[PDB]
Amino acid sequence: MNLILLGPPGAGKGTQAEKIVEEYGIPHISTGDMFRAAIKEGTELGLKAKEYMDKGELVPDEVTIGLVKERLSQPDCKKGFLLDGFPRTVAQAEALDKILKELGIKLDAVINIEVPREELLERLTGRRVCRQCGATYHVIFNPPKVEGVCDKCGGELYQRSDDNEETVSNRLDVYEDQTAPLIDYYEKKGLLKNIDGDQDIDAVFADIKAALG
Numbered sequence: 423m424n425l426i427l428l429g430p431p432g433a434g435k436g437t438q439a440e441k442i443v444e445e446y447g448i449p450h451i452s453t454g455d456m457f458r459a460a461i462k463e464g465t466e467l468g469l470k471a472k473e474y475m476d477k478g479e480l481v482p483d484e485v486t487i488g489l490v491k492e493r494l495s496q497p498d499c500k501k502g503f504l505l506d507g508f509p510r511t512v513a514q515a516e517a518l519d520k521i522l523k524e525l526g527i528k529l530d531a532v533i534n535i536e537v538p539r540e541e542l543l544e545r546l547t548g549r550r551v552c553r554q555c556g557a558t559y560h561v562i563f564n565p566p567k568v569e570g571v572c573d574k575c576g577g578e579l580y581q582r583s584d585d586n587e588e589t590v591s592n593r594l595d596v597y598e599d600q601t602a603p604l605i606d607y608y609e610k611k612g613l614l615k616n617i618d619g620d621q622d623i624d625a626v627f628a629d630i631k632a633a634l635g
C-alpha cells in the first residue's frame with residue numbers, strides 16, 4: 423500500500439496515519455515530523471525550517487522534496503508507505519510523481535479527509551504531541567491514558583509552537599491557497615477517495631478502511 427493522506431491542518435491525518443500504518447505495517451512519512459525532529463536535534467535545517475513553520479508558512483519546496491526523496495529511497499519503503507503532510511503544493515506533487523517514477527513505485531490510493539473549517543481551530547489549539555515519538559493527542563477529543571504522558575513511550579506531551587490561533591489562521595489560509603488544489607491533481611489519477619472527517623476517530627478510521635478495501 424502506497425498511500426497519501428490529504429486534508430487541511432487539523433483534519434485528523436496524523437491520527438489516522440497512526441492507525442493505518444499499524445494496520446498495514448508500513449512507514450509513516452510526515453514532513454512536519456521530520457522538521458520537528460530537526461528542530462529537536464538543533465540542526466541548521468531545523469532551525470531554519472522553524473522560521474517558516476512558526477509563521478504558518480510552507481517550508482520551501484526544493485528542500486522539502488529532497489527530504490522526501492531521500493526518505494522514500496530507504497529500503498523500508500519498498501513494500502508500502504504513507505505520506506502525511508506531503509505534498510503541499512502542485513510543484514511538490516509533480517516532483518513526487520517524478521520521484522516515484524525513478525523508484526519504480528506506483529501510488530495505490532489518496533485519501534482526502536474532509537472537515538469543515540470551523541472545527542479546525544479547537545482541534546489544533548488543543549493538540550498535544552509526544553516529545554519522543556511524535557504521537558498525537560487532544561486535551562479533550564483524544565486524551566492520553568495518563569495526563570501529559572504518551573501512551574506509547576512515556577514521553578512528555580507538549581503543545582506545538584505553531585498550534586496557536588494566529589498561526590493556525592495563516593496555516594489554514596495557506597492550505598486553501600496552495601494545498602487544496604491538489605485534490606484535482608489526484609482526482610485525475612483515479613486514486614482519490616473522499617472521507618468524512620467530521621465523525622469520531624474510530625468512525626473515520628472505519629470509513630478509511632472500507633475505502634481502501
Ligand SMILES: Nc1ncnc2c1ncn2[C@@H]1O[C@H](COP(=O)(O)OP(=O)(O)O)[C@@H](O)[C@H]1O
Binds near residue numbers: 432437
Ligand atoms: N475525528 C476527530 N475528532 C476530534 N478530534 C480529532 C479527530 N481526529 C483527530 N483529532 C484531534 O484533532 C487534532 C488534529 O488531528 P491531527 O491528526 O493532528 O490532524 P492533522 O495531522 O490532519 O493536522 C489532534 O489533537 C487530534 O487528537
Ligand SMILES: Nc1ncnc2c1ncn2[C@@H]1O[C@H](COP(=O)(O)OP(=O)(O)O)[C@@H](O)[C@H]1O
Binds near residue numbers: 506
Ligand atoms: N510538505 C511540506 N511542505 C512545506 N512545508 C511543510 C510540509 N510539511 C510540513 N511543512 C511545514 O510544517 C508545518 C506543520 O505541518 P504539519 O506538521 O504537517 O502539521 P499540520 O497537520 O497541522 O498541517 C507547516 O505549516 C509547514 O511550515
Ligand SMILES: [Zn+2]
Binds near residue numbers: 552554556572575577
Ligand atoms: Zn511517545
